[PDB]
Amino acid sequence: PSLEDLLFYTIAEGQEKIPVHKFITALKSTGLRTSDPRLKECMDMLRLTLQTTSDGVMLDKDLFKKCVQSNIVLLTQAFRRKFVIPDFMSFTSHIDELYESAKKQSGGKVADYIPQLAKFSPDLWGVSVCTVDGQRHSTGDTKVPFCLQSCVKPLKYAIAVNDLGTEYVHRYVGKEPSGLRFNKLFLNEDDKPHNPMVNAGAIVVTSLIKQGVNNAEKFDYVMQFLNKMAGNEYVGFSNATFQSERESGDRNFAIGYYLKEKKCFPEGTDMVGILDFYFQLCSIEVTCESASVMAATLANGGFCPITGERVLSPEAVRNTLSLMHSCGMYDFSGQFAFHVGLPAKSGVAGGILLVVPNVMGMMCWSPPLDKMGNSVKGIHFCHDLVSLCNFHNYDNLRHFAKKLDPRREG
Amino acid sequence: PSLEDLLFYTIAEGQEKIPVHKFITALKSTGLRTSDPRLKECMDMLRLTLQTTSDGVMLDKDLFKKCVQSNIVLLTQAFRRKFVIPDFMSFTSHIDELYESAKKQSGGKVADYIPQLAKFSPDLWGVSVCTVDGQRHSTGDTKVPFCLQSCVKPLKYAIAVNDLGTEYVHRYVGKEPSGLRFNKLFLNEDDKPHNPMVNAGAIVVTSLIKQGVNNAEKFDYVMQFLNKMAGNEYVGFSNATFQSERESGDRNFAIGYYLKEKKCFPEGTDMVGILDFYFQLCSIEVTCESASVMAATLANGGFCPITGERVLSPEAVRNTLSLMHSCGMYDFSGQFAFHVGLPAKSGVAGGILLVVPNVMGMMCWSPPLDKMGNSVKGIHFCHDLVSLCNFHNYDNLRHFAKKLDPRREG
Amino acid sequence: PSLEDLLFYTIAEGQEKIPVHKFITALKSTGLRTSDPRLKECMDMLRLTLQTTSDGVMLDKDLFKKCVQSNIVLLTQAFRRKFVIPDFMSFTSHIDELYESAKKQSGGKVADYIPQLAKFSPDLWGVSVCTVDGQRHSTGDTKVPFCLQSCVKPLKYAIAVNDLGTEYVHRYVGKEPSGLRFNKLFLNEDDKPHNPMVNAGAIVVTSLIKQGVNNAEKFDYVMQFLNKMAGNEYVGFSNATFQSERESGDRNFAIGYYLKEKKCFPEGTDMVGILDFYFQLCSIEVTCESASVMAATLANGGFCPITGERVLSPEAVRNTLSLMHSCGMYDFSGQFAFHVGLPAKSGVAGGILLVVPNVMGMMCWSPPLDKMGNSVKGIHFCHDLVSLCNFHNYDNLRHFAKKLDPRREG
Amino acid sequence: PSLEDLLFYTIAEGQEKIPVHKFITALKSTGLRTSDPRLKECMDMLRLTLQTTSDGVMLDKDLFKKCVQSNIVLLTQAFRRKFVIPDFMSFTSHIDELYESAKKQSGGKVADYIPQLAKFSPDLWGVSVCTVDGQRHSTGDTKVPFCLQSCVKPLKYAIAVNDLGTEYVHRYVGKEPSGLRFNKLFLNEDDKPHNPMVNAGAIVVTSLIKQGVNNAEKFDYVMQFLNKMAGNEYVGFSNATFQSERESGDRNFAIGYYLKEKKCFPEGTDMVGILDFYFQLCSIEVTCESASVMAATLANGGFCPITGERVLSPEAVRNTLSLMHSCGMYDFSGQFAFHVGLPAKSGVAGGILLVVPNVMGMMCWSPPLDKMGNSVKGIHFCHDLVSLCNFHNYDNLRHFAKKLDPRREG
Numbered sequence A, B, C, D: 001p002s003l004e005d006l007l008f009y010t011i012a013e014g015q016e017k018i019p020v021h022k023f024i025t026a027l028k029s030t031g032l033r034t035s036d037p038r039l040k041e042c043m044d045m046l047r048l049t050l051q052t053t054s055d056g057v058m059l060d061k062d063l064f065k066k067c068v069q070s071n072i073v074l075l076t077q078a079f080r081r082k083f084v085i086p087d088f089m090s091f092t093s094h095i096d097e098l099y100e101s102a103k104k105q106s107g108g109k110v111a112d113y114i115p116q117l118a119k120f121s122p123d124l125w126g127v128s129v130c131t132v133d134g135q136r137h138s139t140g141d142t143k144v145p146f147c148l149q150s151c152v153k154p155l156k157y158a159i160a161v162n163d164l165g166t167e168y169v170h171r172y173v174g175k176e177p178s179g180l181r182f183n184k185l186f187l188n189e190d191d192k193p194h195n196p197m198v199n200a201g202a203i204v205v206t207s208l209i210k211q212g213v214n215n216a217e218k219f220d221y222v223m224q225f226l227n228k229m230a231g232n233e234y235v236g237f238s239n240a241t242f243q244s245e246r247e248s249g250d251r252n253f254a255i256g257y258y259l260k261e262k263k264c265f266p267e268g269t270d271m272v273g274i275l276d277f278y279f280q281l282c283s284i285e286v287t288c289e290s291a292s293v294m295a296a297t298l299a300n301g302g303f304c305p306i307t308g309e310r311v312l313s314p315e316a317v318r319n320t321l322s323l324m325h326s327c328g329m330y331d332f333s334g335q336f337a338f339h340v341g342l343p344a345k346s347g348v349a350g351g352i353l354l355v356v357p358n359v360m361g362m363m364c365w366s367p368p369l370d371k372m373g374n375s376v377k378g379i380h381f382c383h384d385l386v387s388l389c390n391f392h393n394y395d396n397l398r399h400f401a402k403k404l405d406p407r408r409e410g
């Protein structure tokens, strides 16, 4: 027997003749994109053999094999419906329905406390799925860059725990939701910020990453770390957003001075520089598609699903997912934990970094915020998503009433 | 072929006649109990068979068919290792190790505020397991009866949501933690108790169950419900605890009057009778074994794993697990959710009702409480349990490092 | 080929038919006693056939088989020189030499402390050995009865740990050595007596054994336990010593009231009654011979060597030996632990209960005590024993210089 | 009859002539390392035989014998499973389990004390095993140098007892534990430090070693002596530790002048110089691996296991193990002797020199210390080790219950 032949005869019409477009169409049907990095050798070989002629354009058993052999394990998985969502084409059809149902929710207000945020049309709206196996789907304005803003707080927290461990990091920042009556003050009883997802805790977390090197290096390191997380999809930087976040961060300066007086930073911290580094991190740019891969790294235990690279240690990913469960949607965190039951993080640009652990990462993005600061359409989509599929964290994987389970072929 | 025979040949192992004990030893090694209520036809037929046969004891292929025919579906899954934890033998060896390790942890003080709690030895330590498939294991003092106390709050909240639905119930009780917060206060900002797991929330929830009947029926209605969740294993009642709980419940009356003044109950509530009913529900008795079956019903989407009976709606089990996650362990809830990441509930008698969704339910019991009111040995065992197994809510099911996964066999 | 004949050929070799006396001389040369309770059925069958037959007195292979059939495993090990000391004859020859050496050491003062057993002769000196296999040897006054006194302290501690557990028992008593130290104090810094071998620790351990019954029952319970350790050899009682210990224990009454005031006993303790139970346990009587079997039981992981019966749990025997190591010999414990490195316990009647783990148990008895309260001859013998043999806890089993190893063969 | 072909017919599947790598894989599975000094002749010969890389590589029986003849006795013992842990592959699998189980106790605090230990990461964690026969295993950061600090106290005590005898050495230092917050006192009743494992006694012991020569020779001579102990594996020296230790030993200078005034040193001692020698000895560097060999020399009666050389007299080793038993772990000595039962010595760098007499030596190393000054992870590992294996000094070798005995076959 032979692994590449057995797959060949499957894609074949039971015949000696596989058009190349047919193989590409059959591959996309699994949800993988031809640009998938773990498929490069195969796609390289297809480019080679499609240069060989122009009156081709078709693969023998051994020429087909000549392309796929380097990537055969991944390709057989895709075609033998081994992926976490076997019938992904039906799943994207539901994601499209949900997208159009949230698209009709044109409420909310675009953040206008800085020009870069207020310029954004209230009509932009995108949703991008990337499963733990790299299957990709997008509806809407998914390639438009926007700033992460607070959506960066879990990513940097995970960096910090990845490099330093849980015990050190939580010498400086708590582990618990603050919660709603006291969503205003800065420090819990132990004089630490309540958790990494509030501004004070985010600011403290910023002060732990790559201590010793300067802010130009530190930002470089976070970018490289973020690139690993997105499988080298789009990550960028809005200097405009940086400058206006910087020129109007009085509450952030208040927090930094308060944390300094309270001795909240590690020894040898330059607080005013950390605020600058914090403003930079908030201005990092992503798209729906590329942020969805970062979310899929978190859904996948710290392995980037479209490169296979270990990016975050599993301690880091669990801690971060834990804190996004209870602290990730501002004052809506408890409501969201209760009704959506998914680790998520929103940001003022309108992003919601959403994680279905073991299944998929998602990024939703619609600039109009509700009065708690969360994207209206993003919040609506998250609710529908879990009304549809047994993705709620305490849904039962066996008895789940009439919710749909996309992990099953039935 | 035929379901009874191919399993018969599975156990026949070369001989034709299967010895009875040999079938029973293979059956128990799956972790099922011969007294499992879903095995009754099979076991009555065995017992009857060993009456009507010489001294046997051996089963022919047709006699084996006669016994196991009624229960053949479950017996196959048990024997084809298709249960949620396939190598249950090895798993219980680990439970035993965890049990022994927490047994060395003294510290804590038995709740002594009432003499019925003060009587229990500090050396009582019991732990019981029941998987979503009915597989069972127990170590230590697991047949000693003790009162649920606060472990009843998630159970009665589940009853309320099952009968009334999420929306009606949470008109009266919020859905968000305290955190470590302050929980001396009674009402959130909507003049609702914060969540069903704090005493004020519990008291209100109690005021919703079976409105209209008297306390004697209300009580029977809840016990009938508990009986089902426990597959009809021990659910008792400690009138000595009840009388002593009501003759020293100043804070609870303080709460009942405050709630009445703030109009937190449904119209037509007799508040002082609701407090009496509340005190009854706290004095309901369980063993580790029987309460572990209650936990498994919540692990199993509302179906009792040892009877197959549906006890709670999926919406009921989901909300309860969400709230045990964030508000179940008193002021340790945030730490517990962070480090253990399992829906759990503690009680002043020393129990920790614990739920590993889709896997198993547990009850750990050791009377000595720590400063926050949680069983010292149970909190310890819970930490070790998740140190060992990738059971943490935000562990990854694929990439989990050196953690052991008992749903795998590799 | 049968074990009975194979063994039969061993002692036959030459003539056929083994004379009974030839069998008996070869049996006792292994160091077993013909009265060994594990050989009773063999010995009854001999005695019977030497009635059944005016013949012989000679055993052919089939008659020898009839006799030794039921005790063949032990008789095999005994004759195949598989006992822990194979050349037992040579070893006892060394015991005798050590015995005669300690005998010329005629110093010390018999405890005048007590009108009774200030009555024993300084010239009484006895030494009894029982190995972990039942091999016995005695030299000197080894059938003279004397009181355990403090030699009972490890035995009742072992009983308490056995019934109650290490963890319950050591809520009431520490585990750390005396030392020259706080020789006079009663309590360590946790307000517990320092360990079970000091009088206040012993008095507390006594208050733990068989709580809830009267002193007559407790005493029978401890004596039945002492009977099993001693393979049912002499365990008696000296009311003469007891009554006299009881009307002259002002120090112990001092300890009992201090312990009561500092809340060291279990709830519901009758301290003055405990003091009388304690006085009773000190007046329990043994011989060297019978007490050597108790030591051997501790040397054998808790199995009585001459009955094969489990008397104490492994946890109980290990704790006891750990505490006899460091607290066993009054203010000589540190010195003794250093120079002898054997778990031992001395009593004021002149006994020293010596345990060579995995080898043998011993009792040495000479009434004259040195200024520290340890038998002058016994301490001398214990020093000579360890200079001769590589029995010191921290001798090496493979590299031991000019020391003799009696587990090895000649 | 032969002996080297016997081994050849064992290593060979009774066929051709044994690939060299197959012999190497067979050897490494006994636990021996190919770098074993006692195997140098055999490995020189394989290195010589395989120098015809022109063509190899099989051992034409006589060619096999050509290599193994010199070291046959040690090679057959290894292959005939005569080593003290026969199934050494299984044992190291348990060591890894124990290692990773301890790896999760991230509690404790690295000695800030001096910058050179404040520079070591709380993530480091290594554990090395060397049995009395040379079988080696390591897990974790076992090649990272760290200072012995007080782990050197038993090694220099043994040297002094080796060179000067027990009577002389204990004219100056005692032989008994002090005994729990007893530790402040520098001197016992006879105005000698209490034992060689406290700083006062260690300082006095240091002043006995190689009197007459200057401190540069003395340090050299202790290095040569430590080189033999480690089988010439890594022994080094940290000058940075040394200078930091000397610029901050006010306590040691306090002890120094106390001993000088109390006339505790040998005549003609230069106390201030001895302090400097002492500081050097504490700054001597080892690795986990090389330290485990030092520990295995003490487990092996003073013979280095991987060289066969007699390094310490048996008097020195037994005295050293006796004093490590009772005095080795600071205020935790008594608790440690009781619950672990192994002679051990800890150091502020985070090391624990662990000895299982007649079985193996070990070094565990993790910088973070508990409040008693003992490595958190190391203490956790020691507890687990004795909870698994019957290595407790007073575990019975025959009746040992739940525990694995690695000295035994199947």
Ligand SMILES: O=C(Cc1ccccc1)Nc1nnc(O[C@H]2CCN(c3nnc(NC(=O)Cc4ccccc4)s3)C2)s1
Residues within 6 Å of the ligand: C184, C185, C186, C187, C188, C189, C190, C191
């Ligand atoms: O002592 C000398 C001379 C001397 C010798 C050496 C050192 C100093 C003085 N002459 C006396 N000897 N005994 C005397 O009366 C003793 C009898 C028992 N008793 C106590 N036992 N345990 C105690 N400690 C605690 O209950 C908690 C605790 C323990 C340790 C530290 C703090 C609290 S008190 C008082 S008078």
Ligand SMILES: O=C(Cc1ccccc1)Nc1nnc(O[C@H]2CCN(c3nnc(NC(=O)Cc4ccccc4)s3)C2)s1
Residues within 6 Å of the ligand: D184, D185, D186, D187, D188, D189, D190, D191
């Ligand atoms: O107590 C506290 C309170 C405290 C402080 C911090 C934390 C907790 C508690 N602090 C002190 N600790 N040590 C102090 O002085 C040191 C130096 C002198 N001294 C001695 N060492 N050896 C001696 N010899 C005998 O003792 C013989 C001898 C023994 C028996 C009988 C006669 C003579 S003297 C100890 S001061």
